[PDB]
Amino acid sequence: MWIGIISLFPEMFRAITDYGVTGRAVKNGLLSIQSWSPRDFTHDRHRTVDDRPYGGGPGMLMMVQPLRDAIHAAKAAAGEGAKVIYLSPQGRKLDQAGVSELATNQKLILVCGRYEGIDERVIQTEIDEEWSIGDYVLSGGELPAMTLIDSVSRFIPGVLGEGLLDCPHYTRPEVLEGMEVPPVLLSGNHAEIRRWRLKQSLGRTWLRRPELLENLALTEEQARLLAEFKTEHAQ
C-alpha cells in the first residue's frame, strides 16, 4: 500500500509515521506515505492558501490553484488507478465494511481540507470519492486521513503480526479490588470460553447498540445465548 497526502500540515502525519503498528509498517515498507502541501504551490508573497467564498459566508475556503497543483503533483507521482479521496463530513460514513473496500486499493491519494472546505468544482474534477469519519465536525482532514490510514493498514498482511461489539477482556491479577476474572477464562475449556465471549458480545451489543442487532441475522445458538443474557440481566 502506497498513500499520497495533500495537506497544509504534512508534519501532523508523523503521528502515524513514527508510532505503533503504523510506524512499524512504515519502517518495514508495508506502507509508504508522501505528502504534497498546497503551500509549496503558492505564487504570491504571502503564500496564500485560503480564499473567500462566493455568496458570503463564515469562513474561508482553500484557494483553488495551490490546491489543484498539489493534487496534480500527487497524481503525477502515483499514476493510473490511484483512487483520489476527499475527506469530508459530507462523504460516505466510514465503517468496518467500507474500511474493507478501501483496504482493497494499492494506491490512494487523500485530500485534507482546512477552513470551511474546498470548491465544489475541484471535488467534481479532481476527486473519485468523499469519505467521512463520522457525523460530527472537525476543523481539518488530517485526523480523518490518519484515521482512514490507520484502520485500513490493519488489513495489510505484514501489519498486524462481523456485526457485534467485542466482549470484555481480563489480564493479571486474578482479583483486582475484590473483582475476579470470570472463572470460565481461567478453566481451559475452549468452547465454554468461546461461548462466554459470544454471549457477552451479544449482550453488550443489545445493551449499547441495539440497532446493530437488527441488521444481523442471528443463528439459533446466538438467539439462545442472547435470550439467556437478557434473562440473567433482569436479575
Ligand X SMILES: Nc1ncnc2c1ncn2[C@@H]1O[C@H](CSCC[C@H](N)C(=O)O)[C@@H](O)[C@H]1O
Stretch that binds ligand X, among 15-23, 110-118, 160-168, 219-227 (CB under 6 A): 110-118
Rounded CA-CA distance 85/71 in Å is 11
Q: Which cell is 18 given?
A: 513514527
* Non-local CB neighbours of 75 within 8 Å, separated by 6+ positions: 82, 84, 109
Amino acid at 223: A
Q: Which residues pair with 86 in a beta bridge?
A: 111, 130
Closer to ligand X by CB, 35 or 132: give it: 132
Per rule CB under 6 A, is residue 138 in the interface with ligand X? yes
Rounded CA-CA distance 209/164 in Å is 9
Among 23, 53, 98, 140, indicate the residue that binds ligand X (CB under 6 A). Answer: 140
Per rule CB under 6 A, is residue 51 in the interface with ligand X? no
Per rule CB under 6 A, is residue 144 in the interface with ligand X? yes
Rounded CA-CA distance 233/235 in Å is 5
Per rule CB under 6 A, is residue 164 in the interface with ligand X? no
Closer to ligand X by CB, 6 or 25: give it: 6
* Closest approach of ligand X to the CB of residue 144, in Å: 4
Q: Which cell is 108 given?
A: 490512494
Closer to ligand X by CB, 39 or 197: give it: 39
- Residues found near ligand X in the complex (CB under 6 A): 87-90, 112-113, 116-118, 132-134, 136-141, 144
